[PDB]
Amino acid sequence: GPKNVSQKDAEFERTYVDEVNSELVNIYTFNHTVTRNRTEGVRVSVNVLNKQKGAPLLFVVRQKEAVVSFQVPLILRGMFQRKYLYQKVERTLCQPPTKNESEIQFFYVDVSTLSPVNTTYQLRVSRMDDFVLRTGEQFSFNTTAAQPQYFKYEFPEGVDSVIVKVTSNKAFPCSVISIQDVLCPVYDLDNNVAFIGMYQTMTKKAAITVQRKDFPSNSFYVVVVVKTEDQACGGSLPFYPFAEDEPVDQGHRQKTLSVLVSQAVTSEAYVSGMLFCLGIFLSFYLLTVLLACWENWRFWNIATIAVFYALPVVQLVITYQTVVNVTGNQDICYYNFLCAHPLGNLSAFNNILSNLGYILLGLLFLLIILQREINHNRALLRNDLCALECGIPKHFGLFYAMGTALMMEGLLSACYHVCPNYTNFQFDTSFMYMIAGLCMLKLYQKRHPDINASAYSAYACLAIVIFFSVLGVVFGKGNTAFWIVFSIIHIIATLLLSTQLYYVDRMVLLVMGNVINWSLAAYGLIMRPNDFASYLLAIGICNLLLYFAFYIIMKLRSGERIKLIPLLCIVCTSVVWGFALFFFFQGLSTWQKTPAESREHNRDCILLDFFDDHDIWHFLSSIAMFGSFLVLLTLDDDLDTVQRDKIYVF
Amino acid sequence: GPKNVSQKDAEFERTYVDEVNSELVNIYTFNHTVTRNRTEGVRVSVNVLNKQKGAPLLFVVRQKEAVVSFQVPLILRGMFQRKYLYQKVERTLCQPPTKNESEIQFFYVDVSTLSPVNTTYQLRVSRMDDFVLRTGEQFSFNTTAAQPQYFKYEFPEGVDSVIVKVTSNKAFPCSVISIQDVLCPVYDLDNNVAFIGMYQTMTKKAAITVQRKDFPSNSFYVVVVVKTEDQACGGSLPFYPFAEDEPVDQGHRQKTLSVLVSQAVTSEAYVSGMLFCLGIFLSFYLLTVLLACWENWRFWNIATIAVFYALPVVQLVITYQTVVNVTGNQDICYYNFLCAHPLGNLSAFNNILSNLGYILLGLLFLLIILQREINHNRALLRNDLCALECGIPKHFGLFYAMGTALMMEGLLSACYHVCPNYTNFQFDTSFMYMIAGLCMLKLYQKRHPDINASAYSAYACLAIVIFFSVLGVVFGKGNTAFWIVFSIIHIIATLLLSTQLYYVDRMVLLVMGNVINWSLAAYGLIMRPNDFASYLLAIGICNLLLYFAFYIIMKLRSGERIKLIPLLCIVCTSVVWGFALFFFFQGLSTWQKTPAESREHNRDCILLDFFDDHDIWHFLSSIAMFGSFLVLLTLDDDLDTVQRDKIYVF
Ligand SMILES: *[C@@H]1O[C@H](CO)[C@@H](O[C@@H]2O[C@H](CO)[C@@H](O)[C@H](O)[C@H]2NC(C)=O)[C@H](O)[C@H]1NC(C)=O
Ligand SMILES: *[C@@H]1O[C@H](CO)[C@@H](O[C@@H]2O[C@H](CO)[C@@H](O)[C@H](O)[C@H]2NC(C)=O)[C@H](O)[C@H]1NC(C)=O
Ligand SMILES: *[C@@H]1O[C@H](CO)[C@@H](O[C@@H]2O[C@H](CO)[C@@H](O)[C@H](O)[C@H]2NC(C)=O)[C@H](O)[C@H]1NC(C)=O
Ligand SMILES: *[C@@H]1O[C@H](CO)[C@@H](O[C@@H]2O[C@H](CO)[C@@H](O)[C@H](O)[C@H]2NC(C)=O)[C@H](O)[C@H]1NC(C)=O
Ligand SMILES: *[C@@H]1O[C@H](CO)[C@@H](O)[C@H](O)[C@H]1NC(C)=O
Ligand SMILES: *[C@@H]1O[C@H](CO)[C@@H](O)[C@H](O)[C@H]1NC(C)=O
Ligand SMILES: *[C@@H]1O[C@H](CO)[C@@H](O)[C@H](O)[C@H]1NC(C)=O
Ligand SMILES: *[C@@H]1O[C@H](CO)[C@@H](O)[C@H](O)[C@H]1NC(C)=O
Ligand SMILES: *[C@@H]1O[C@H](CO)[C@@H](O)[C@H](O)[C@H]1NC(C)=O
Ligand SMILES: *[C@@H]1O[C@H](CO)[C@@H](O)[C@H](O)[C@H]1NC(C)=O
Ligand SMILES: *[C@@H]1O[C@H](CO)[C@@H](O)[C@H](O)[C@H]1NC(C)=O
Ligand SMILES: *[C@@H]1O[C@H](CO)[C@@H](O)[C@H](O)[C@H]1NC(C)=O
Ligand SMILES: [Zn+2]
Ligand SMILES: [Zn+2]
């Protein structure tokens, strides 16, 4: 009538090969002595031998304050009614902190089945000598979809923040790495892991910044859970029998992970970064002040477009950043988690200080255009013959545009670097096209006075490039057919604009111009970055940096000669452009289909432990732009007495 | 030595009052006969009497294919280390479909504790005669945070979609209502419920549209889970002892819910809606064709701004809609779920057809301005004296702006109505300010020819209103201090613009103008809607609809007389404005802090079972705008012979 019930004492680190049926329940009693200042983990492992799909085993682990249960072989789900079946299951047991200095704690394991056949299982309860993580010591382990793991880290003395870096040398088991507090239970299942805490799907890398003020116990759990399907990490899926009713044996895929918890930049990294920024971008101001005191003693549309954008920029990103602030789902903003230093609510504060160069060099330029205009008007009371003939008609209206577009760049990008994304991308790099545009009009608008009608001619072209990026944005991972057709339609524009400016060197002019477009084509074809609007920016400068040379070479072959004061700004502008494009090309693939794949491109800080490569791009770009404004400005200053060459140049 | 183990037969619908200690385990054996075409639910209920916090009961329900376990009193968590403790727990048992026509199925209940004191519990397994929901029949039930519930709905014959409407006559227990398939297990816990399926947090209402193609079993589970804290529904929290270590007794709060699953519009509602739209908006075209054949026989900035917006509009919302498409978290887009008819990937397709009036009446207007220009130029070959003196200088350049801004409105709003939101709001209503702006310039630019300098004067003002909405957007739930200070700064603008146009009626002019601003102030102060940019739109038309009257009243007191052809468009424009503002004011509070609160304002469809109030607003607004363009156009057609009154009017 009544079932057998076998109660038997058991021991740690000793494997039991028993069996149960529908008329048999096995109960094992384990005990262990726990101590306050040395915590251990108890990991139960079950494994059924050559089991038929009739009816599973039912395993219950009973502790003083918790009941855990599962059924073996454990069945997990897929997307489209796909079941995966695991013969072997494991769990680390959650247990609350011990109230005494040391106490004996019992727990029980209960094995029962409702199938009428002898089912042979294999049980083993082991003690983990590696449960407590250490600061600065790599630790490696294994996990599968039926064997989730978790470890404990407790903060050292006086360390107020850490970063947990987890790495894997192989791509496709997926994973979720959650960071939870040390209160039982622990949510280490495919459906519990995203309930609370802050987490990150990985493929090869994950990195999470943790601070004490979120964990009043001064400790937390790092939880690793492997997933049954790799779609969330950019992987494909097969199904030969998978969609059928029966489950699919999937116990053959493991993930081998390494975890390292290391201290973060304490506080003086922030001071060093701020002092570096201020020093380098005020050296320019001091240099200009001394330069002036030496040498002297020897419109609304651009702002409104940004204003009618910045508020949508401010509102969109803030409404989008707050999710990770409250949800902990860190697969939403595409930071560089290995170099991302929080301040207040900002996650990557260093990716915002970097945009101080645009602000403070777009403001130093406006203080040059203003000083040139004022000085020129202070000359107009003396009435020298150089009104507009002995020199060139001064049109600062589009200088002010250049000096104020550089300012808005240090706000469109500083606000974009709050949660970089795909929907969020167009704010920063697309507005550098404007500066690229204005740097082209000047050299045209210098040899052609009545170009105010042509000023609006280029305004139409700028939206097309934004539309072209938008057209590329419509399919961010578009096929080659999009890429090559855009590549070939690029090829037409090579000779198309070359004809506008066109005599031996003009036939030589076609040599370097067409090559670069052809050169830049292949590096696009072979790579095809997910980021396209950033790609075309490179074509922007490369043609722009070429077109300076053309204006010089034609000027090189006249009686007009280049003075050093507007020449020393040509070599240094090109040197900084060379460096700036090096760090620009470092991060160009570091944005891909999914955050898991976009995260295996992260890399540590470089400068003062604070700034990465993309911060060094915000630095050199704002100096190259400013270094190019003074080229357009000073270049033709030797023509302060000539009225024939300047007038009949074009 | 070994524990007692009591195995005892049990019965449904009969309560057991037993006790266990650390040396006693109780096991109850239940059985029940299940049948294929009649499914029942088995609900286990446990309740501990006057239990001390020493060590809980541990309850295990063991079935053939599933093990369920919990611990009583059950502890749930809060946000800031807050624990809530429930003495009574209940679960409905998941069970896979029976393979035979009828079979006997056993399950077991296992009660055990590790505390050394007699703990007295109360167990009851009951059978539910109300597990299978029916189509079109309200069903009411109770639930708490420790007693989650779920019911089964199986599709009737030939019904391809249903809507599940759940309602509660009281606000603050929160809830999550998930819709899952009928494969075990069921995720009805505070941490499982959001794993899969599509769900909705409610406060008083929820409504979810379900389609067979997602559920190949032709059935699903409606799962209701009550939450321990009401922050996600806009509620506050107390904590007198709550933040302390001990848990808080919280078994005193219930939620009483009603569930109704009703069939959705089959297919001809879509046909009726499309036919209605086409008929009403082509009656205008046919009417104009007959009107012309009767009577005759008797620039880039506006598009570029939208183009540099529409692509960000298209990209942002599409990148934002796809989340609910793949996540099922329907607390992301602020639809009207009671009237939201899907088509393809679009969730609310009727909120897009409604924007056909802007497209097809912004296009019919451009075919009037074009015909007036062509006819006028076909007259300029005859050279009548009415070039610009006997009439008024024709400036269609800003007519084209009006006729093309109405077109872009039917795309900015049609794209906004793909996931209405807070970040997403500015796209639709802010661009109706432009049409409101251009409707003001015409009457000004008719009495003042050289107003091209004043054309850009108002362009600055438009961004300020957008900035004012943005300033209001920065704190969407801002305090009164924002609201009243903006209200009083409004009061200055009352007399400020009144002075611009200013004689007895001009002193009367101050009567109605200031009152409306004062009138519109209180209805803002008393209500203070979360939607502010939509509020100021009302102030937009109200002043705009007033300023038409002023131009008439001054015209009413001259020798100039109003012909009926430009008068019959004045009464009908005002009638449609009156109706349009009625349906506009229906949905004005239907957007609040949280989607749960924003959803208790939903209301059923009105017209042809397809269009709600806000669709009737897209309909009447596009006819009122068009009805106002023909006022600005035809009004002063009687001045086709006068050159004194027109010239010296202003
Ligand atoms: C707690 O468990 C330990 C096992 O880890 C028990 O110690 C064993 O007791 C059995 C009883 O005969 C024998 O195998 C040995 O005496 C012990 N083996 C080892 C490896 O220590 C211990 O008795 C248990 N304590 C209680 C109170 O049950
Ligand atoms: C994690 O799993 C890997 C894969 O099984 C283990 O590496 C293997 O260990 C066995 C034991 O001798 C051998 O087959 C080889 O040494 C390893 N095979 C390889 C690397 O292909 C590894 O030992 C497991 N444990 C850890 C901590 O990594
Ligand atoms: C299945 O459970 C039912 C109870 O629902 C059992 O029927 C009862 O059996 C006990 C045994 O003495 C008595 O209370 C009555 O004979 C029955 N009561 C009722 C209300 O039916 C039944 O015996 C069980 N079947 C098996 C095979 O165990
Ligand atoms: C749901 O819970 C409510 C609240 O307890 C129940 O309504 C009460 O029922 C008891 C039973 O007689 C009485 O106190 C009153 O009839 C009700 N009190 C009220 C309405 O304040 C209700 O019966 C429960 N069940 C359902 C299906 O609603
Ligand atoms: C288990 O039950 C069987 C009855 O089938 C009987 O051998 C005895 O009661 C139990 N066995 C032992 C070893 O106690
Ligand atoms: C800390 O643990 C060690 C382990 O040997 C032992 O001295 C004792 O259990 C604890 N002592 C203190 C001072 O915490
Ligand atoms: C150790 O735990 C026991 C529980 O039985 C209890 O007496 C107390 O918490 C601790 N012992 C002492 C002497 O404090
Ligand atoms: C295995 O089955 C045999 C009979 O087939 C019987 O001895 C018992 O059910 C099982 N043996 C065990 C549990 O040792
Ligand atoms: C329960 O165990 C006790 C020993 O404390 C003893 O009465 C007997 O073995 C069991 N009771 C019954 C009624 O079988
Ligand atoms: C359906 O259920 C009824 C219940 O009385 C019974 O006729 C039988 O179990 C089933 N019959 C068919 C035809 O499915
Ligand atoms: C009913 O279930 C039993 C399980 O014991 C099995 O014989 C079969 O699935 C069904 N019976 C028949 C006669 O088909
Ligand atoms: C209640 O406790 C008494 C002794 O305090 C003992 O009879 C047994 O543990 C409990 N009584 C039951 C289970 O009937
Ligand atoms: Zn950047
Ligand atoms: Zn609308």
Residue numbers in the entry:
A (entry chain B), B (entry chain A): 24 to 321, 450 to 653, 685 to 832
From the study:
The apoSIDT2-pH 7.4, apoSIDT2-pH 5.5, and SIDT2-pH 5.5 plus miRNA structures were determined at overall resolutions of 3.16 Å, 3.21 Å, and 2.87 Å, respectively. No reliable RNA density was observed in the map of SIDT2-pH 5.5 plus miRNA, and no conformational change was found in any of these structures; therefore, we used the SIDT2-pH 5.5 plus miRNA structure with the highest resolution of 2.87 Å for structural analysis. The 2.87 Å EM map displays excellent main chain connectivity and side chain densities for almost all residues of the extracellular/luminal domain (ECD) of SIDT2. Notably, the only difference in these three structures is that an additional dense area is observed in the map of SIDT2-pH 5.5 plus miRNA in the region that, on the basis of the AF-SIDT2 structure, was expected to be the CTD. An additional area of density with extremely low resolution was observed in the map of SIDT2-pH 5.5 plus miRNA, we cannot reliably distinguish whether it belongs to the protein or the RNA. It has been reported that an arginine-rich motif in the CTD is capable of binding nucleic acids. As the CTD is unresolved in the maps of SIDT2 alone samples, reflecting its intrinsic flexibility, the binding of RNA may stabilize this region.
The systemic RNAi-defective (SID) transmembrane family member 2 (SIDT2) is a putative nucleic acid channel or transporter that plays essential roles in nucleic acid transport and lipid metabolism. The TMD of each SIDT2 protomer contains eleven transmembrane helices (TMs), and no discernible nucleic acid conduction pathway has been identified within the TMD, suggesting that it may act as a transporter.
